[PDB]
Design a protein around this ligand. Structure first.
Ligand SMILES: CCCCCCCCCCCCO[C@H]1O[C@H](CO)[C@@H](O[C@H]2O[C@H](CO)[C@@H](O)[C@H](O)[C@H]2O)[C@H](O)[C@H]1O
Ligand SMILES: CC1(C)CCC(C)(C)c2cc(C(=O)c3ccc4cc(C(=O)O)ccc4c3)ccc21
Length: 236
């Protein structure tokens, strides 16, 4: 149907893959830090978790700038969209790295934490709800292209508060929505509820990112200094 749409799919897929390695491509390793009992916070796991979060924020920015038209938005709007969506995309990303058989999540350096360690690294009381979100992503069996498109749709959203040109953002989102439906239906024609199910996960993701911002407030009181500067940028 449209060469332009096919190219958009290819571009978004490549941008995702090049900013987010697949679980299969990573050499996993583990830590024995606070591995068998939940505690309020393990500072060694927090330091590594938060370092890895900073690095992924920079990768999400890199991803965003590869999305067609994103750099043609005002710099203010680019920053507003990134602030509004980066926690959503972080959470989607980590949940895509869930290995159910071991109940672990894997970071982009290969660090593989069990559920107790994810709790102890900072998720705290939000841990099991995030793992349940990850578990309910599994039946969708999304591929990397679908994850990348969904991430783009989450980011390029015209409803965000304080956008200067929300209509322009909406027009950038339209082909991404078209692209995801076309791709998802082509890939699995006998599962036509996959596209609407994927879109409704954006709503679920917003709920868990809202809870994540609430957790950031209590976590701040548990750690001995401020959070890393790019995390604070995301949270404001
Ligand atoms: C969500 C809240 C964030 C809102 C937006 C604010 C974040 C702004 C990010 C702009 C980052 C500028 O990026 C600039 O320095 C980064 C860190 O040294 C470099 O980042 C480079 O190194 C990283 C390793 O540290 C790699 O993972 C990046 O892929 C690589 O490009 C950039 O190549 C350079 O262009
Ligand atoms: C705001 C703050 C600090 C506190 C509150 C909670 C615990 C909800 C939180 C969670 C995350 C988070 O889900 C995350 C972290 C690292 C990640 C690293 C990678 C990666 O290596 O590819 C991918 C996804 C990631 C996703 C980030 C920050 C925060």
């Amino acid at each position: 149907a449209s060469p332009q749409l096919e190219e958009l799919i290819t571009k978004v897929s490549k941008a995702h893959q090049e900013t987010f390695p697949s679980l299969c491509q990573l050499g996993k390793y583990t830590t024995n830090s606070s591995a068998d009992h939940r505690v309020q916070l393990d500072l060694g796991l927090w330091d590594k978790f938060s370092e890895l979060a900073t690095k992924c924020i920079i990768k999400i920015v890199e991803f965003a700038k590869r999305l067609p038209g994103f750099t043609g938005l005002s710099i203010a709007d680019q920053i507003t969209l990134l602030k509004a969506a980066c926690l959503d995309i972080l959470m989607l990303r980590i949940c895509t790295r869930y290995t159910p058989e071991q109940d672990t999540m894997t970071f982009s350096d290969g660090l593989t934490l069990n559920r107790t360690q994810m709790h102890n690294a900072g998720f705290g009381p939000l841990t099991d709800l995030v793992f349940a979100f990850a578990g309910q992503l599994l039946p969708l069996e999304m591929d990397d292209t679908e994850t990348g498109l969904l991430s783009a749709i989450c980011l390029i959203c015209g409803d965000r508060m304080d956008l200067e040109e929300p209509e322009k953002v909406d027009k950038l989102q339209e082909p991404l929505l078209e692209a995801l439906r076309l791709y998802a239906r082509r890939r699995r024609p006998s599962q036509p509820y996959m596209f609407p199910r994927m879109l409704m996960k954006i709503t679920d993701l917003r709920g868990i990112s809202t809870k994540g911002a609430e957790r950031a407030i209590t976590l701040k009181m548990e750690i001995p200094g401020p959070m890393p500067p790019l995390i604070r940028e995301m949270l404001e």
